[PDB]
Design a protein around this ligand. Structure first.
Ligand SMILES: Cc1cc2nc3c(=O)[nH]c(=O)nc-3n(C[C@H](O)[C@H](O)[C@H](O)COP(=O)(O)O)c2cc1C
Ligand SMILES: [Mg+2]
Ligand SMILES: [Mg+2]
Ligand SMILES: [Mg+2]
Ligand SMILES: [Mg+2]
Ligand SMILES: [Mg+2]
Ligand SMILES: [Mg+2]
Ligand SMILES: [Mg+2]
Ligand SMILES: [Mg+2]
Ligand SMILES: [Mn+2]
Length: 311
RNA sequence: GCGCGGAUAGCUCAGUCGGUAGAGCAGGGGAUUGAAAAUCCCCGUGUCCUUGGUUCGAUUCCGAGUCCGCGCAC
């Protein structure tokens, strides 16, 4: 039966939003924003700012497990930073092989799958054996020709599981190009679990994805902001969160403190989440207009909190 | 002169469809020391090369300019 992962989303799904979402969902796991590794062991404070859940045994307050993601190339430094992530409490570690476009990392590793093998292998070897080492890949740089070589590099590295985002790097976030079929081909070749990713917005689209890919584990990104209870919609075919409950969730958000807030976190992030929500809720367009021009946190917090959920 | 790619803190670098830039090192302060170094605590406010524009909001998108690297006009 079905696993649903919350995707890593740099600048969107930080610890606050992971707190808020996990409370009203049944996500099986969340991935952190990437920790960017070059050629040094990063200090403890970087891992704690990216993953505050490390001080709660790698769990959000409602209890959902969280896993730190690394983005980088050099095997020695991926290994040292992976070991630190798990020593700090991370429930395994994830390698990013999908980020666009320099120091090597993300999607660039997809041009030479040997680098995926070396990076992931060194990670697997530095992390205690029963903690998961996952890798998240796109299908290729500007084509899908190497997708089997990529998947095979991850498996031969000894990785626990592979998430496949069903697009090349050059295909971006374009909907017409999603290739759940290719995820399925990859799933049939590998012995390790393959988790499908891309263009899951609701129950029906998750059913289509699982039917076509053959996966019963999926990862959801953008759709998890559009519809804040998407995991339950997808798993149990519940209705999308009603608009008054979405507004209550945003109110809660405005009451969470962001560590190191340079002053405009809620201005930024309330407006950002609203731009996702208006793809789905007519009501989010009105609310976005009402807060559009508020340019400080006191003002936006006061306006969001003043909305009467009963009216 | 023409293409393509660059320009982020004193230096080396990080920076996901636009959401408010942060590590390491140097450096400054504390502890420590006879005084230092090393170690532990603290300092991360940059016209994001300059400029105009779009936008509620630009390192990011658009125009202009400069400088740098590569390969084509002397
Ligand atoms: C704003 C944004 C930030 C993202 N940041 C990351 C990231 O930090 N790491 C990563 O592996 N993928 C990242 N992704 C990719 C997503 O995890 C996911 O693979 C992609 O959005 C496709 O899934 P979706 O159609 O369900 O959104 C990001 C995507 C978006 C839109
Ligand atoms: Mg962003
Ligand atoms: Mg825009
Ligand atoms: Mg010093
Ligand atoms: Mg600053
Ligand atoms: Mg400018
Ligand atoms: Mg204006
Ligand atoms: Mg401007
Ligand atoms: Mg524009
Ligand atoms: Mn950069």
């Amino acid at each position: 039966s079905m696993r649903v992962l919350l995707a890593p989303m740099e600048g969107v799904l930080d610890s606050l939003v992971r707190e808020l979402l996990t409370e009203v969902n049944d996500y099986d796991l969340c991935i952190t924003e990437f920790v960017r590794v070059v050629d040094q062991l990063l200090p403890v404070k970087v891992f704690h700012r990216i993953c505050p859940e490390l001080q709660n045994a790698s769990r959000t307050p409602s209890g959902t497990l969280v896993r730190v993601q690394l983005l980088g190339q050099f095997p020695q430094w991926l290994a040292e930073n992976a070991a630190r992530a798990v020593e700090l409490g991370s429930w395994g570690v994830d390698l990013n092989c999908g980020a666009p476009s320099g120091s090597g990392g993300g999607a660039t590793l997809l041009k030479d799958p040997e680098l995926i093998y070396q990076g992931a292998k060194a990670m697997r070897e530095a992390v205690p054996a029963h903690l998961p080492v996952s890798v998240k890949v796109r299908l290729g740089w500007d084509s899908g020709e190497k997708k089997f070589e990529i998947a095979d590099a991850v498996q031969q590295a000894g990785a626990t599981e592979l998430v496949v985002h069903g697009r090349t790097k050059e295909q971006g976030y374009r909907a017409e190009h999603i290739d759940w079929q290719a995820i399925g081909d990859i799933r049939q070749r590998l012995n390790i679990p393959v988790i499908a990713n891309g263009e899951i917005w609701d129950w029906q689209s998750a059913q289509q994805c699982m039917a076509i890919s053959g996966c019963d584990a999926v990862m959801i990104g953008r759709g998890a902001l559009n519809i804040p209870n998407l995991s339950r919609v997808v798993k149990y075919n519940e209705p999308r969160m009603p608009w008054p409950e979405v507004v209550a969730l945003l109110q809660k958000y405005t009451r969470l403190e962001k560590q190191g807030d340079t002053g405009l976190y809620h201005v930024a992030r309330i407006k950002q989440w609203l731009s996702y929500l208006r793809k789905e809720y007519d009501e989010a367009t009105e609310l976005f207009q009402h807060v559009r021009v508020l340019n400080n946190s006191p003002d936006i917090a006061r306006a969001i909190q003043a909305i009467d959920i009963e009216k």
